[PDB]
Amino acid sequence: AWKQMSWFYYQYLLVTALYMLEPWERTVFNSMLVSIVGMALYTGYVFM
Amino acid sequence: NPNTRVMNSRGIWLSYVLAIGLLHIVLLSIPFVSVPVVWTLTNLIHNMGMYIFLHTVKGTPFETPDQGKARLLTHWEQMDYGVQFTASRKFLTITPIVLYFLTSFYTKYDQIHFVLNTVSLMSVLIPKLPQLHGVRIFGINKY
Amino acid sequence: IHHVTQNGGLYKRPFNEAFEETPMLVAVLTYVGYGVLTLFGYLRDFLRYWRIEKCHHATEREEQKDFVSLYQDFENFYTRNLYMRIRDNWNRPICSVPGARVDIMERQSHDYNWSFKYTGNIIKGVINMGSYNYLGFARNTGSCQEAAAKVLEEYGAGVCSTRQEIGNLDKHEELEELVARFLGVEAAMAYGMGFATNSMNIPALVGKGCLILSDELNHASLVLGARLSGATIRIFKHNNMQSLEKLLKDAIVYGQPRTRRPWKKILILVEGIYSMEGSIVRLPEVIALKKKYKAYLYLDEAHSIGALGPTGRGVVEYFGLDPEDVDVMMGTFTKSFGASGGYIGGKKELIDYLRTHSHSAVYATSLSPPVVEQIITSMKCIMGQDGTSLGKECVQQLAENTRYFRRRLKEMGFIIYGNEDSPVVPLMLYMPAKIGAFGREMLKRNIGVVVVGFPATPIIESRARFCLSAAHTKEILDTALKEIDEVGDLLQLKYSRHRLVP
Amino acid sequence: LVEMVQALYEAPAYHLILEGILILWIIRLLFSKTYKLQ
Amino acid sequence: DLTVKEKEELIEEWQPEPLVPPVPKDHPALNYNIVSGPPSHKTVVNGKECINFASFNFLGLLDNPRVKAAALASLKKYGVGTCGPRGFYGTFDVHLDLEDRLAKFMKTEEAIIYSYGFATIASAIPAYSKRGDIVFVDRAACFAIQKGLQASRSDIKLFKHNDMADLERLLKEQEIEDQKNPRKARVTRRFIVVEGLYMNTGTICPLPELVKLKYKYKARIFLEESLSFGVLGEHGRGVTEHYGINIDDIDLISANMENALASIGGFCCGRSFVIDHQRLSGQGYCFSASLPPLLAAAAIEALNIMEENPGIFAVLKEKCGQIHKALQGISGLKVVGESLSPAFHLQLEESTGSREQDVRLLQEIVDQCMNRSIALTQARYLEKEEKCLPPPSIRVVVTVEQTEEELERAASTIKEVAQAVLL
């Protein structure tokens, strides 16, 4: 479960080329991607 | 020189269309923004980005193939060795025109939303002409 | 006999290769990585412009700030935003004789591959698949180590003069006569650098008013020699006989560009094997085309001399053709004989002319005696002149290993480029982060390979090269093929649509 | 988007002219050769 | 236009020139003199025992037992040749030691080594000079510099030999063109390619008054001390130590390990800001195999010997200035070269007429000198392909192995055949 879930994060790190980035550059991308999705649900709910 | 031959790579047209499609989804998600101005922002941002990336930056990101013979040409002038009307140079001209009809139509042809898109479309169309290939107005970004 | 082409080229044996195209979903997902890297590189330049201290990279002297800037900031954009990030697996230093088992000096970085620092520990016993060691002549004990040690005691480390001056020994005269017997030509000449054989002899043949039909994927030395010659250059598609034959028509019925005068002569530059895109050239069709348009040929076989052919004579023996149909025949001693230097072979009228009008023969120093003697002793073993059977075994073993090793990768689901008989096996891995992951994983599993990027190949065609050898055993190949399978499953590198059936 | 076609019918006449000119420009450059700039 | 019959009629009529021109006349060369054994102090040329004044080992070191012992050990540990281009498992741990050792010897910051002496300066110049650049080069430069300048498609403006007035006059004119286009003169770099102790004339270049021009006209210097490395100065560091110039004012220094180190290869030294660029840009360093380890182990030991005994340069120069005094008086030959250079020339006074007659005339003194016991050679050039072709001459090279009596015999033996051929 957890071990098999870590492999998916590993595969996510290679597709987006986040594997070869500094740790402080990973946080920026992760936050900037979570915020977009989070504000794409508030709008979806208020427009339904 | 695999820089002038990047717009021939397998799946770059489809990966370029999806980029514009994704730009229109992060803009549509803003909690309080009307649809016409969303469409106007999409077109303006795409045109500004394409103008910067195709008609402003001169040179290669890597060491130049020849002894620096491409250091004074934008990415549009060196595309396909400067040979006009290739397959990609038709696509890159038709795309911002087709994207203009949609933003004219979704704005219900408002009088104030036509003086922004037209001035934007013209700016990314004038430089694509065969006569302006190598010309530099006044001296703006000559060297 | 086997099959014929419209040109006239005759193949005696089947000639087949595969260049499977990248799948669409994989092609789209690499542009995401490249765009992310570009965006973060821009955000890094601006941040390092004035904020980040970056007290590492050296700058210009305090007294030379008034001068014009030496370099261009945007010139080396990819060198410090892409390549640099994963450049921890390129200049790996070794500390042993390289073949089939190498020792590597361990090193680790603290500031993200900006300044390495050696620890002191040595990774002993690493399967080597990154150095050109066909026929396995790169060793430190054998019959060739005695001949090079005896000649190094009664001569020296090097000569101190030029061929036309007092720096022409009898060792060179002995070597140049034996190379001719090896290849099957009238005469030959030896130089002392493979790169300086192309860039210092091509300009002596053609000049202003001549045409060069160069190939798409030629080596750097060929291009540099062509540019120094002073002639017009036209590139045709890689290994396309319908594109090279169309360029030979418009070059004759249209003459020179402006004056529309006839060309003085037309020269064709090709190679036996292209290393990156491991593939063989179609000599029957290329020779059929030079006989119909009266062109000249210049074959460069550095990766095929000793690696192909039933006896190790190159591609000309691999096909069965006449070695007298090729005007100029280049090679190198540094990829199959475990030595250094180059050579050119051909007619006696051409070597006699190169002996006086070549930049190397008059301005550069000669070969060294200790390295010349090893070439002689080694090339006497392929011929079987030593009185043993250490020339057939290695030749037969290399082909055996290549045939066994390529089919096993085909049957696992990877994507392999090139002809079915080439000893260079490029694996395909398109993502720009899998380049950095593959080297790290392979070295962690005691296997040394080489990876190529975007400045050397096309945008979405990254790969890993797997130069084989005749010193590899069956056990070493099974061991290497095991960890490659586990790593390919871990990184999901099996893109083959039509996996081969065992 | 029901009012959009209604607006299109009421759209100013000078804007459809430009639209038609662009449509003609897209068809004029779609049937051209290649001619290297020499 | 041009139907398929005209097209095939034009293809059957074309006739190319042969790949090599037929010999129009008997060439002066094409007679490589064979050397039996090593080209040492007492060699055997064309089956005759004779002392050589032709090899370029100024310090001996070619038949030094200490140097051969240090190469045998690295031979029996590493093999003979590398199998890769220094970027694919081609870099050993002896290359790093040699590169670290050279920088310490030159008191510079970093070093880079090539595997061929000709390609070190023909690959360095085009790495820094580009299309829109201006290069001021001395008129009597060697062939490698010419090739490097041709590769770098840049503007080339050559001045006279050893006159600062012409260089300054040349630089002042370029200063005018800046005023006529200020926005273009801010993206063009300027270089001054100078070679200390020219091999084509045997003269030393003046640095003290050439460094001043760099700080007044903003132009960088490229030194090429490939013939003064290990010869000039109190410690054998070159011409910078000879004059007393700070090493940091030069920008880049190039030499080869084929003359004083008696090995194969070349190197470049300089600050770490300028040397680290050509690890990815130098054509001959990236796309080429690396130097064999036994050769590098021979250069390290030669460096050890030079560092341990710094009094060998004085005894080199003392007997270098001893034969340059006994060669004054030859009826017909004039000595061209400095009183300190170890390889000067011997031109022909009152030239006959054509270029071929002088070559034959000189080849008469060389052939006659070999009958006695003095091996000489004459300078060789590519007459068709060269900017400024020097006159015919006979090289005279001086090492530390030759005794003083031997030098006197050479000087007196080269005068008796010179006043009996040109008379």
Numbering used by the authors:
A (entry chain C): 9 to 56
B (entry chain D): 11 to 153
C (entry chain B): 45 to 546
D (entry chain E): 10 to 47
E (entry chain A): 51 to 473
What do the study's own words say?
The ORM/ORMDL family proteins function as regulatory subunits of the serine palmitoyltransferase (SPT) complex, which is the initiating and rate-limiting enzyme in sphingolipid biosynthesis. In humans, the heterotrimeric SPT core enzymatic complex, composed of SPTLC1, SPTLC2 or SPTLC3, and SPTssa or SPTssb, catalyzes the first and rate-limiting step of de novo sphingolipid biosynthesis by condensation of serine and palmitoyl-CoA to generate 3-keto-dihydrosphingosine (3-KDS). As a critical mechanism for the homeostatic regulation of sphingolipid production, SPT activity is inhibited in response to elevated cellular sphingolipid levels in an ORM/ORMDL-dependent manner. In this work, we demonstrate that ceramide binds directly with and inhibits the human SPT-ORMDL complexes, a process that is important for establishing cellular sphingolipid homeostasis.
